[PDB]
Design a binder for this molecule. Structure first.
Ligand SMILES: *C(=O)N1C[C@H](NOS(=O)(=O)O)CC[C@H]1C(N)=O
Ligand SMILES: *C(=O)N1C[C@H](NOS(=O)(=O)O)CC[C@H]1C(N)=O
Ligand SMILES: [Co+2]
Ligand SMILES: [Co+2]
Ligand SMILES: [Co+2]
Ligand SMILES: [Co+2]
Lengths: 246, 245
């Protein structure tokens, strides 16, 4: 239950000219560290990181039938070629297939979505802006601190959802496996916004490493899609320098 | 049905290996293999037994839960990598025999036998010692039966809770890529003799796109320098089929 500033991590930000924040917490000690306490508490559009709660809610409400649900490509055109295919839950999460999750949100509906975001203490819990886009271009905002809190509850199966559904979503979030560690993670990208009002990019997740568990959340301002790989490379370098991965 | 594909034998002959690969797309109703007879021949499971043993441990409550830590008592263990506290995935991935020996002891013979019958797990023969039957006893399982067992696990159709099946499934993840997850487990009984060799295993499944592939590899082994072939031969076969890599 603590947080401390460590401004030395700022070196990885300054080298790439990035304005952003990294939050890293050790589960055993309940201790977090961040480069920027102020930005750690600033709230941004979750963008595709919202697929985590949306998946849990989808399963809870029965909108997603089960773990082996296939989301069929009806076949019409879409915004990315990688979305123009049948997808599993992991596939739809991993490729961040927006129309899949828009449909899930519509079927859940506003009253149930609101209820679950309250139960999950998910950001400002403001779902105004259209049920199928509040997380991408609406009023919903969440901080890096809140993302770590949320992911810890998921890891511990302490969200207000079945253990089974929490487990389903956890496996779908596995992005790297090594003999000494598993990484569960999710990216997000709201867009380039304006040069005055940039978009946000995220990488959030946790690392199960020996007997320790490290929860993390990264975000940064972004106004050019060329910068998007920094959302993984900055926190990856940090975690490598801490000995957690790599 | 099981259908022979003798073209796969290339990857075996090249390394002078006597073994079998069984690969099934979608389900175990139809599998392909290099060797029809060896596909159904039964061998000691060795560390592949950690999969049922983990499920049974959770079902019985011996493993309290998903976040169970298996504490090291500080006494010598046969590998240094085992001389530390371990999570369930840790104990599976480093193949920490003593952790699983203790699980087995606590499960006990009666419950062990009950669950191996429920799982249709090989010859279901657990005799000769509760903490070593899968290591040096009479238990035997084929590559075909490993595929069936893993398919049941994937489908949550084993006689165990969905939760416990999901726990063990995640603990088996060994490779993650954007297009696929591999769940798998290795095993190695030992070298025995040139006349009576040990057995090496790699078993698992690949979740790819909207397809699933179940697999099981075993080979005779009498020299530990050959052990990496247990992964490389089936990996090469699956790479040529476009399933991984
Ligand atoms: C989520 O952020 N989105 C869906 C999809 N993938 O983005 S990610 O790779 O950054 O996770 C396309 C971009 C984005 C969106 N909704 O605009
Ligand atoms: C399982 O077969 N064993 C335990 C440990 N790891 O096994 S693996 O690498 O073959 O998966 C060492 C080898 C073997 C054993 N019992 O000695
Ligand atoms: Co409901
Ligand atoms: Co995990
Ligand atoms: Co043979
Ligand atoms: Co899986």
């Amino acid at each position: 239950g603590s947080i401390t500033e460590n401004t030395s991590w700022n070196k990885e930000f300054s080298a790439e000219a990035v304005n952003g924040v990294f939050v890293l917490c050790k589960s055993s000690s309940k201790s977090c560290a961040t480069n920027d306490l102020a930005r750690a508490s600033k709230e941004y559009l979750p963008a595709s990181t919202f697929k985590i709660p949306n998946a849990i809610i989808g399963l809870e409400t029965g909108v997603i039938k089960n773990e082996h649900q296939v989301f069929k490509w009806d076949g019409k055109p879409r915004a990315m070629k990688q979305w123009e295919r049948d997808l599993t839950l992991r596939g739809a999460i991993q490729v961040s297939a927006v129309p899949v999750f828009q449909q899930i949100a519509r079927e859940v509906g506003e009253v149930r979505m609101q209820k679950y975001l309250k139960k999950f203490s998910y950001g400002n819990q403001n779902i105004s802006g259209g049920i199928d886009k509040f997380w991408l271009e609406g009023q919903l905002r969440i901080s890096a601190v809140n993302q770590v809190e949320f992911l810890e509850s998921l890891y511990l199966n302490k969200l207000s959802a079945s253990k089974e559904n929490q487990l389903i979503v956890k496996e779908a979030l596995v992005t790297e496996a090594a003999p000494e560690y598993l990484v569960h993670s999710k990216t997000g990208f709201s867009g380039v916004g304006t040069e005055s009002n940039p978009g946000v990019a995220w990488w959030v997740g946790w690392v199960e490493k020996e007997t320790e568990v490290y929860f993390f959340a990264f975000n940064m301002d972004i106004d050019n899609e060329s910068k998007l790989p920094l959302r993984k490379s900055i926190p990856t370098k940090i975690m490598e320098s801490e000995g957690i991965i790599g």
